[PDB]
Amino acid sequence: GASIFRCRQCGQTISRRDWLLPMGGDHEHVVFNPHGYIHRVWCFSLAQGLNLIGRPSGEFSWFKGYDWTVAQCGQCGSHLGWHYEGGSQPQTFFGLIKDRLAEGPAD
Ligand SMILES: O=C1CC[C@H](NC(=O)c2ccccc2C(=O)O)C(=O)N1
Ligand SMILES: [Zn+2]
């Protein structure tokens, strides 16, 4: 039972442990926004249940080569992280904020 990652606010299924993706040799990145707020971000190859908000941006990306878009939970609107695109190996992935996910057993 790969564990399941749900939205912490509502419980919607978002991703799974077996979809964790090492970027830079690690699937966990401790990063901060340009205001100096820390986020602990886990990278996933795939995710479901998310809505993308806005257009992609290249500014301030944590991951070289990728442009990003805000990702919210499609059920409750919680800001769960970001979708990345435009790169290679992989072309796209998700960076999700660990503390906004709740990891647990399958249904
Ligand atoms: O790779 C990326 C994804 C997006 C991310 N930006 C933010 O985290 C951001 C920017 C301005 C204000 C707040 C935030 C935030 O979501 O915490 C950033 O700095 N890098
Ligand atoms: Zn939610």
Side-chain angles (χ1 to χ4, degrees):
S3 75
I4 301 302
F5 294 86
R6 297 182 174 83
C7 178
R8 180 183 298 286
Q9 284 277 126
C10 74
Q12 190 183 26
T13 291
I14 308 294
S15 196
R16 313 162 54 88
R17 187 172 270 279
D18 44 2
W19 295 338
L20 287 164
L21 174 72
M23 291 299 296
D26 207 311
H27 64 270
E28 173 178 70
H29 291 254
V30 180
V31 289
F32 52 84
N33 69 19
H35 307 295
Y37 193 86
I38 294 167
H39 295 297
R40 184 189 285 278
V41 171
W42 284 24
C43 299
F44 290 87
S45 61
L46 290 180
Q48 59 176 256
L50 300 169
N51 288 166
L52 301 189
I53 313 301
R55 278 157 51 97
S57 178
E59 254 225 309
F60 303 115
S61 183
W62 302 305
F63 299 102
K64 166 178 296 197
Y66 296 89
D67 293 338
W68 55 268
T69 308
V70 166
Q72 284 180 178
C73 173
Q75 177 162 66
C76 76
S78 184
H79 181 195
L80 297 184
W82 309 273
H83 183 254
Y84 291 89
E85 63 187 80
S88 53
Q89 295 177 2
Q91 287 189 87
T92 65
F93 69 96
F94 298 84
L96 302 176
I97 301 163
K98 179 57 161 60
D99 300 331
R100 295 185 186 159
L101 299 174
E103 186 181 357
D107 273 346

